[PDB]
Scaffold this active site. Structure first.
Site, PDB file in Angstrom:
ATOM      1  N   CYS A  93       1.990  30.329 -11.185  1.00  0.00           N
ATOM      2  CA  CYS A  93       2.463  30.930 -12.429  1.00  0.00           C
ATOM      3  C   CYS A  93       2.763  32.424 -12.427  1.00  0.00           C
ATOM      4  O   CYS A  93       3.835  32.848 -12.865  1.00  0.00           O
ATOM      5  CB  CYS A  93       1.509  30.612 -13.591  1.00  0.00           C
ATOM      6  N   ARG A 122      -7.515  27.400  -2.768  1.00  0.00           N
ATOM      7  CA  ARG A 122      -8.672  27.585  -3.624  1.00  0.00           C
ATOM      8  C   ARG A 122      -9.924  27.400  -2.791  1.00  0.00           C
ATOM      9  O   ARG A 122     -10.047  26.449  -2.032  1.00  0.00           O
ATOM     10  CB  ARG A 122      -8.646  26.594  -4.776  1.00  0.00           C
ATOM     11  N   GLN A 140       1.453  22.046  -4.791  1.00  0.00           N
ATOM     12  CA  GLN A 140       1.665  21.474  -6.119  1.00  0.00           C
ATOM     13  C   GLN A 140       3.156  21.270  -6.395  1.00  0.00           C
ATOM     14  O   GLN A 140       3.967  22.065  -5.941  1.00  0.00           O
ATOM     15  CB  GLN A 140       1.134  22.420  -7.205  1.00  0.00           C
ATOM     16  N   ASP A 142       4.810  21.980  -8.873  1.00  0.00           N
ATOM     17  CA  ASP A 142       4.636  22.833 -10.027  1.00  0.00           C
ATOM     18  C   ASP A 142       5.900  23.295 -10.716  1.00  0.00           C
ATOM     19  O   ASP A 142       6.992  23.252 -10.147  1.00  0.00           O
ATOM     20  CB  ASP A 142       3.838  24.053  -9.540  1.00  0.00           C
ATOM     21  N   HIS A 144       6.992  26.021 -14.387  1.00  0.00           N
ATOM     22  CA  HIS A 144       6.655  26.719 -15.608  1.00  0.00           C
ATOM     23  C   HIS A 144       7.916  26.784 -16.425  1.00  0.00           C
ATOM     24  O   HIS A 144       8.980  27.153 -15.924  1.00  0.00           O
ATOM     25  CB  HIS A 144       6.104  28.103 -15.309  1.00  0.00           C
ATOM     26  N   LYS A 224      -5.155  21.589 -21.857  1.00  0.00           N
ATOM     27  CA  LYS A 224      -4.360  20.807 -20.938  1.00  0.00           C
ATOM     28  C   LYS A 224      -4.456  19.311 -21.093  1.00  0.00           C
ATOM     29  O   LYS A 224      -5.517  18.749 -21.381  1.00  0.00           O
ATOM     30  CB  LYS A 224      -4.734  21.163 -19.508  1.00  0.00           C
ATOM     31  N   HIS A 270       2.906  24.965 -18.516  1.00  0.00           N
ATOM     32  CA  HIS A 270       2.630  24.745 -17.096  1.00  0.00           C
ATOM     33  C   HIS A 270       2.607  23.237 -16.905  1.00  0.00           C
ATOM     34  O   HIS A 270       2.068  22.517 -17.746  1.00  0.00           O
ATOM     35  CB  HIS A 270       1.226  25.216 -16.692  1.00  0.00           C
TER      36      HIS A 270
HETATM   37  N1  LIG Z   1      -8.732  21.375  -4.774  1.00  0.00           N
HETATM   38  C1  LIG Z   1      -7.667  20.604  -5.031  1.00  0.00           C
HETATM   39  N2  LIG Z   1      -7.321  19.653  -4.135  1.00  0.00           N
HETATM   40  C2  LIG Z   1      -6.250  18.888  -4.397  1.00  0.00           C
HETATM   41  N3  LIG Z   1      -5.428  18.922  -5.446  1.00  0.00           N
HETATM   42  C3  LIG Z   1      -5.800  19.881  -6.317  1.00  0.00           C
HETATM   43  C4  LIG Z   1      -6.884  20.740  -6.189  1.00  0.00           C
HETATM   44  N4  LIG Z   1      -6.967  21.589  -7.278  1.00  0.00           N
HETATM   45  C5  LIG Z   1      -5.950  21.243  -8.037  1.00  0.00           C
HETATM   46  N5  LIG Z   1      -5.212  20.196  -7.516  1.00  0.00           N
HETATM   47  C6  LIG Z   1      -4.065  19.512  -8.107  1.00  0.00           C
HETATM   48  O1  LIG Z   1      -3.177  20.469  -8.672  1.00  0.00           O
HETATM   49  C7  LIG Z   1      -2.870  20.082 -10.042  1.00  0.00           C
HETATM   50  C8  LIG Z   1      -2.539  21.309 -10.863  1.00  0.00           C
HETATM   51  O2  LIG Z   1      -3.630  22.225 -10.830  1.00  0.00           O
HETATM   52  S1  LIG Z   1      -4.254  22.832 -12.160  1.00  0.00           S
HETATM   53  O3  LIG Z   1      -5.226  23.867 -11.719  1.00  0.00           O
HETATM   54  O4  LIG Z   1      -4.724  21.710 -13.021  1.00  0.00           O
HETATM   55  N6  LIG Z   1      -3.050  23.552 -12.893  1.00  0.00           N
HETATM   56  C9  LIG Z   1      -2.344  24.521 -12.310  1.00  0.00           C
HETATM   57  O5  LIG Z   1      -2.768  25.177 -11.368  1.00  0.00           O
HETATM   58  C10 LIG Z   1      -1.263  25.108 -13.176  1.00  0.00           C
HETATM   59  N7  LIG Z   1      -1.139  26.495 -12.769  1.00  0.00           N
HETATM   60  C11 LIG Z   1      -0.010  24.327 -12.853  1.00  0.00           C
HETATM   61  O6  LIG Z   1       1.118  25.011 -13.393  1.00  0.00           O
HETATM   62  C12 LIG Z   1      -4.121  19.339 -10.476  1.00  0.00           C
HETATM   63  O7  LIG Z   1      -3.826  18.481 -11.577  1.00  0.00           O
HETATM   64  C13 LIG Z   1      -4.493  18.549  -9.223  1.00  0.00           C
HETATM   65  O8  LIG Z   1      -3.782  17.335  -9.094  1.00  0.00           O
HETATM   66 ZN   LIG Z   2       0.641  27.366 -13.931  1.00  0.00          ZN
END
Ligand SMILES: Nc1ncnc2c1ncn2[C@@H]1O[C@H](COS(=O)(=O)NC(=O)[C@@H](N)CO)[C@@H](O)[C@H]1O
Ligand SMILES: [Zn+2]
Ligand SMILES: Nc1ncnc2c1ncn2[C@@H]1O[C@H](COS(=O)(=O)NC(=O)[C@@H](N)CO)[C@@H](O)[C@H]1O
Ligand SMILES: [Zn+2]
Lengths: 401, 401
Positions: A93, A122, A140, A142, A144, A224, A270
């Site tokens: 984002c 992460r 992702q 992803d 926005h 969310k 998002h």
């Molecule tokens: N540690 C992880 N391992 C695998 N997939 C992950 C992990 N963390 C998040 N995700 C995936 O990434 C998706 C989006 O992450 S989120 O933190 O929910 N949302 C975002 O980061 C928002 N910024 C998206 O625009 C999650 O729904 C999940 O499917």
């Molecule tokens: Zn986001």
């Protein structure tokens, strides 16, 4: 149907001690990943999205401004250069807002849908890591969406429709939706949260989706919608998600000229449809138990000769199918045909074409499937057209079944 | 001529202080990037390469084993988690060896050509950063070939042929070749270096490629054939490269079972054809002065009306060209035709289709090019077929020029 076991058996990926939670995608696993990207891109075009790519890291200062440092620091990897500290991005984002901020924006530019296959990292606790489902490095699907308050309803509805549109392709029988509300640590006023939470609840009901509240589980920047999918042990995994953000754009100085000629701050939605490629592939692997639909199979067809006598024919057919856009491989090894068939069957290759003398003289091929179905002799062009149709339609079923 | 100025004019990318040497790819620049990936993938298929994806970081211990820590520490970014130190990868080789090490390998598996569009990060001194040419984060069209010493000649030759093959698509008339010899800081014996350096020199001669030695510029793990391309100031930039490595495989315990049934260590050839997508795009931008060949153009066609009378017709044609796979945009603004053409010419759009009443009645379009030419009116279906051919063949020239 443990995806970790199937992943090893089908040579899809592997992980090691030197890179906890970091996936090494092997050729066949990467082929699945890439085919999913093709599918997502086809939808990005249909639903009108731009596609960009942001940097891997940015100065800590920027992450402090968004609120990520105070509300997300424990999950971020940091590094440094020339006395400056950087955070490897845990989300795409902020980078998208930086792109949005380049060039004056008008209401005529909204909604602006910006997608990215964004690599996020992460620092998940090692004890929580689990195969492809929970990793430290993932991609992702992803996006926005920058829009006006009046456009929220239509844009959130569009995201929801996109989720069911894409999920329908996989035949998911169980999709559970949750609405996660304001967490203990958050940015934005209670008034903004009231409005955002209400907007998402209304969207879910207008789309006829039953959902349950998950109190305090929303993101620090907004509530969310969570689309939950399940693995073989019926464990819940958040995949698709839609989040409504009235705070980040302001913190990062995003704005546009309104129809009234006044400066306005855009709303940001998002959303990730598959969630992460890693987690989604983990779900598909257990759902299909390794029998990926033909359009997703690493290798769709393997052509085998009985003896060296048919080698030329097999090479010709392999080139013919390859030029037709089919992922095909020739198996001309000095092994018994029964040995070759078993190998590819165990690898879950959708179709196996066997060429004996009668096939060569005939201009046909003997066809069998990974399920053990014997389709007999078929004309080469007939099989090509049937395969192209199965692939193009992303069908869940193979020739006759 | 400067790619940074052109990049701004065409809205391809931007860079900012919070991410020194990190590129923010805008939709249009990312479109060029993606087309180059598609092009590279078409050659990976033709030249028989697998495609994988390795993790972004690995434990420092692994980098100590390869020699990177002692000989490349300064260029690496580091981070940590749970009392463990990791290095963000500056190269893709170690990860490829980790993938190779999964599962028993036999001589029948070689040569094994493993490619990756690998995201690399190197802590380049900020003072040396320059647009897209020298960045801190870049993507290499990398690959490592694992082979027997007997296969070295053919594999190196294949890489050299691949370089000229791909470069010919862009029409480069100046490709300078150098053989970079052992650096002051290196791993491996003098004997190994004499052999590797000689192997590369012989490969160049075998291909009748004139070259010059570049003393001490080889990698710490092996010598390199450097292919340099030049920018608008005629400054040399290293792009393609082929390196011979007799050290990394052994350091990472790579091995295979030879015909004699004994454990052997594979030779590894490193090679990037474009170099990095970032640097190659910088080179192309200056080489073409923004006049990207149609297959690479962010926007290939712009269709415009004269008055609202032709708006519906323009919209219809836009969807038609879009369905035909062409990157097309409609310009329905209330501006004069000349105004529109001047703007899109500055944007380097290959073709501009003008639609007046005559066009709407005859089902044709008036064709104009970014080179200031008027091609007259043409039948819509003929324009589409011709554009598809220009794109499909990745031609350097536009219609009738
Ligand atoms: N540690 C992880 N391992 C695998 N997939 C992950 C992990 N963390 C998040 N995700 C995936 O990434 C998706 C989006 O992450 S989120 O933190 O929910 N949302 C975002 O980061 C928002 N910024 C998206 O625009 C999650 O729904 C999940 O499917
Ligand atoms: Zn986001
Ligand atoms: N800082 C940089 N910015 C842009 N491109 C770069 C940078 N450093 C290297 N490259 C590109 O990446 C190519 C390969 O880099 S290399 O160090 O020579 N070799 C490799 O890393 C080998 N490991 C390839 O297998 C170079 O030829 C160059 O085109
Ligand atoms: Zn390498």
């Amino acid at each position: 149907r443990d995806h970790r076991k199937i992943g090893k058996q089908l040579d899809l990926y592997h992980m090691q001690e030197e890179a906890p939670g970091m996936v090494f995608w092997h050729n066949d696993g990467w082929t699945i990943f890439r085919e999913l990207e093709v599918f997502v891109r086809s939808k990005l075009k249909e639903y009108q999205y731009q596609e960009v790519k942001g940097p891997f890291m940015m100065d800590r200062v920027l992450w402090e401004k968004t609120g990520h440092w105070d509300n997300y620091k424990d999950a971020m990897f940091t590094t440094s250069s020339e006395n400056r500290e950087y955070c490897i991005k845990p989300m795409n984002c902020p980078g998208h807002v930086q792109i949005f901020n380049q060039g004056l924006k008008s209401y005529r530019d909204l909604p602006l849908r910006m997608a990215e296959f964004g690599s996020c990292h992460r620092n998940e606790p090692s004890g929580s890591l689990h195969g492809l489902m929970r990793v430290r490095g993932f991609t992702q699907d992803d996006a926005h969406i920058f829009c006006t308050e009046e456009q929220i309803r239509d844009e959130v509805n569009g995201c929801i429709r996109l989720v069911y549109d894409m999920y329908s392709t996989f035949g998911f029988e169980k999709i559970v939706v949750k609405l996660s509300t304001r967490p203990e640590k958050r940015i934005g006023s209670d008034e903004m949260w009231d409005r955002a939470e209400a907007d998402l609840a209304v969207a879910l009901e207008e789309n006829n989706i039953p959902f349950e509240y998950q109190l305090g589980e929303g993101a620090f920047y907004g509530p969310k919608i969570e689309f939950t999918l399940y693995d073989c042990l019926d464990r819940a995994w958040q995949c698709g998600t839609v989040q409504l953000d009235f705070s980040l754009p302001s913190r990062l100085s995003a704005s546009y000229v309104g129809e009234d000629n006044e400066r306005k701050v855009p709303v940001m939605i998002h959303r990730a449809i598959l969630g992460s490629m890693e987690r989604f592939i983990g779900i598909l692997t257990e759902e299909f138990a390794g029998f990926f639909p033909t359009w997703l199979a690493p290798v769709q067809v393997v052509i085998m000769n009985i003896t060296d006598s048919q080698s030329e024919y097999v090479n010709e057919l392999t080139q013919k199918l390859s030029n037709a856009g089919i992922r095909v491989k020739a198996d001309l090894r000095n092994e018994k045909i029964g040995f070759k068939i078993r190998e590819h069957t165990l690898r879950r290759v959708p179709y196996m074409l066997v060429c004996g003398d009668k096939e060569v003289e005939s201009g046909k091929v003997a066809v069998r499937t990974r399920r053990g179905k014997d389709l007999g002799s078929m004309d080469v062009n007939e099989v090509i057209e049937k395969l192209q149709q199965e692939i193009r339609s992303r069908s869940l079923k193979q020739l006759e079944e």
